[PDB]
A = this chain, B = another copy of it.
């Protein structure tokens, strides 16, 4: 455990976290310093010093952060700007070879300067080019009236959370301090991160609805100004579709930037390029499938009226923080990304409609069955399906609980995996409260139908 091994290196009672950038580390150090100034917060960089090759030097670095063991929402500050697992292993191998600097926490490495005895080459650049190309190909619009996204309209970050924060920070440091709006995007760290980006109190329309849009449009017409709006297609966990057409009309008429997350309802399934100025994506999820690598994307629509100002910011502030091992497995697993989306989307519809028709369930959240099924159709590509995520609303919550227990599949917080996985309310607790969310995997429709059926029987008396 690189964390354990780095507390050993600094002779240690406190608690620690590890980050890739000097920047993100101190983003946490403030949160602790505000919750308790005069608390001894320590920020130690580890760096490999004598290394001819530029690969090891650039990547064999990290920031340990010690802070009083004496944990609010920093969950999304860490889950988001943390270090990769593949990265953190890469450092634990080399931790003896690298020195520290802050105190006595300036300890040099017992084996510093020694020549180590990685697979990837060139900072995984050729594989990142592959990743950018896939994202650019799949977001291409069915509209020939539009410019294509190119691979250099695509930006890659350590995680999806990080990609989100990076666009929030650009909007704020862009000229003109106007409000940020968050539309529906909930049950995630986006509102925390948007706050960490300088938008002190954004306007949250939490339900994603047209009523909420009305309130917004009244606001804007009254003379209220707004720099950016954040939204996410096929919202978690209810599979809602925001009205991306109306949002783009409001955006054109009142001058704000539209940022959509397409993680859940994929670019394979939906054509949203025409309504978004920027498109964020978590590559950790379905794009990868395997649950083994981490990565975030950020797509700047060359059609946006804000392309020049957004691209130039992101570019002038770009640092490559996608660890190359991650980048490699990602470029590998993302080739069947459209086929896995299509397969998973097909199974999901199946058992979504299966479960919809069982007398123990009140209704199922799936784009084919939710109030906004017609909104989803405005953006659904032909011959493409209805997504891999769904959620179950049972009639009696006792039943849901017995059902979840009896369900012999993977359980946990991940989505977009090649294996189906479920999560109850015990989690996703920072919309009924006995909801059971299902991310449908690459398994046969029968196998899944089997496991669901058996679990249904176990929960009935």
Interface residues of A (CB under 8 A from B): 5, 8, 11-12, 93, 96, 107, 110-111, 117, 119, 290, 332-333, 335-336, 408-410, 418-419, 441-444, 447-448, 451, 454
Contact = CB atoms under 8 A, between A and B. Distances in A.
A379 B8 CA distance: 37
B117 A8 contact: no
16 contacts: A8-B409, A8-B410, A11-B408, A11-B451, A12-B408, A93-B290, A96-B419, A96-B442, A110-B443, A110-B448, A111-B418, A111-B443, A111-B444, A117-B333, A117-B335, A119-B119
A107 to B, nearest CB: 8
Contacts of A448: 110
Contacts of A117: 332-333, 335-336
Contact of A110 (B11, B119, B333, B442): B442
A447 to B, nearest CB: 5
Nearest to A408: B11
A453 to B, nearest CB: 12
A124 B107 CA distance: 39
Nearest to A114: B442
B110 A8 contact: no
A96 B419 CA distance: 8
A388 to B, nearest CB: 15
Contacts of A12: 408
A384 to B, nearest CB: 21
Quickly give the copy total for this chain.
Answer: 2
A408 B444 contact: no
A12 B93 CA distance: 37
A107 B451 CA distance: 12
A408 B12 CA distance: 7
A119 to B, nearest CB: 7
Contacts of A110: 419, 441-444, 447-448
B11 A454 contact: yes
Nearest to A451: B11
A442 B409 contact: no
Q: Which has the most chain B C-beta neighbours within 10 Å: A93, A111, A332, A410?
A: A111
Contacts of A447: 107, 110
6 smallest A-B Cβ distances: which pairs?
A110-B443, A110-B444, A11-B408, A110-B447, A8-B408, A111-B442
Contacts of A332: 117
Nearest to A347: B110
Q: Which has the most chain B C-beta neighbours within 10 Å: A8, A443, A451?
A: A8
A448 B8 CA distance: 12
Nearest to A420: B110
A336 to B, nearest CB: 6
Nearest to A411: B8
A181 B443 CA distance: 54
Contacts of A119: 119
A337 to B, nearest CB: 11
